[model samples]
Target: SVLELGKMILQETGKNAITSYGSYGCNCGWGHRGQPKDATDRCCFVHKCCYKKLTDCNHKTDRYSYSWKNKAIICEEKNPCLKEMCECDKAVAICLRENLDTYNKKYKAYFKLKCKKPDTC
Candidate 1:
């Protein structure tokens, strides 16, 4: 259900979909807490919201491990929670891929001091 819903939202809104709880940002690491640093980071914020919306899933368990590092999920077991988590990860991965150019442009501008920080919009 969440998987289909997430895909539908992505199709309709692309990178402009709002989070379920109105929260934003990578929600990890230092710098610009609660605000997205770029299009890539915005995807992460959306992913976090997706997990929060799912009662059986959470970011802590579903988020990519450093060792695994955003690898494709392979769910051999038919666990519904795992399925939802995989879908969440897949959605964000697609988001990140789609927004790469936007993210790079913002990052380059921020690096050149053209802006104080990367923008989500």
Candidate 2:
């Protein structure tokens, strides 16, 4: 069921890859600082909030250890709590794609700045 939902999310968004943006404040993990870095980060921020409300999962503790590599596998697991967690992440992925333009612009500037100051970067 989660796998089907994942496929639907990807198809609906017309995106094959899910990318995390920004380096601070609930971008893809726990809310450290108060504000999200951008719209994409805000999706994750809200996702964490959803987890807090709907499940016993902790955004920091229950996160998949190999999230980038094994997210699909984790979602395919049968645990009820994990199922809800997976749905939240899937929802966030859709939200990230919805804000793709803003995310791309932010990262483009970030990369440009990094290239400009390789030493500091």
Candidate 3:
């Protein structure tokens, strides 16, 4: 009976960890005028990717830098849209989702990391 209880506890713990990790937050900026195109680090995952190097992200970026703030401002002048292809705000959300795992894995926390704006600690 003791052995069975221990196994059950371990299983429950494992499941809880996975659930909490993946459900980081409410995608704070969803369905809104989210951060601008050049403001990459301002996405909902800001706290996760804020201080990490651009290289750390699985996704690619042209604004290369050691700080997320600097890199966020180094992107193209505007969205890669022709003012007809898409909404920059919506596109930003897409990128954040695409790299969600990358950020979560690199930071490894539950909404408790540092730097929500990437400019400070």
Candidate 4:
């Protein structure tokens, strides 16, 4: 159920939500935390930094050193929207990971994603 929660949390809070690690089962791994398929959701920051909407995210993820610390996004993946949307400030962006509306989750899966600690920034 963690993976489902992770996916749900992602939908609710995006990459910045507090996190909860997943457990392995008969057909699951340490990742995905949920899913009937061979997928695992990244669950390391559910309680860490589950804040910010597309507009409140003033954080940066350009470099791994800093970005990796609060890596709430799945890199190399494209945003689900053809035209990306952001908070009114333009600093916070609506990430693809948080846009899991059934159609986008296909190209918006997290392979080596990272969640950042809030308040650090």
Candidate topping TM-score: 2
Candidate 2 structure lDDT: 0.49
- TM-scores, all candidates, are 0.45, 0.47, 0.22, 0.16
TM-score for candidate 3: 0.22
Error of 4 at 10 (Å): 8.5
How much is 96 displaced in model 2, in angstroms?
Answer: 0.5
Q: Write the per-residue lDDT of candidate 4 for residues 1-121, one digit (tens) a residue.
A: 1232334345434543322212222111233322232122222222212322333222232111111124442222144221121111111123223323322233234334433322231
Candidate 1, 33-115: lDDT as tens digits: 34566676677666766666668655444432211234433333246775666666567656765765665432322222322
Ranking by TM-score: 2, 1, 3, 4
Alpha-carbon local distance difference test for all models: 0.47, 0.49, 0.30, 0.26
Candidate 3, position 110, lDDT: 29
Backbone collisions counted per model: 0, 0, 0, 17
Select the stronger candidate by lDDT from 1 and 2: 2
User: Over the stretch 14-38, how does candidate 3's per-residue lDDT look in tens digits?
Assistant: 2232332333332222221222222
After aligning candidate 4 to the native by TM-score, how far in Å is the CA of 75 from where it should be?
10
RMSD per model, one decimal: 10.8, 9.7, 17.6, 15.3
Stretches of candidate 1 off by over 4 Å are 1-33, 57-77, 105-121
- Residue 82 of model 4, lDDT score: 11
After best superposition, candidate 3 residue 82: deviation in angstroms?
A: 18
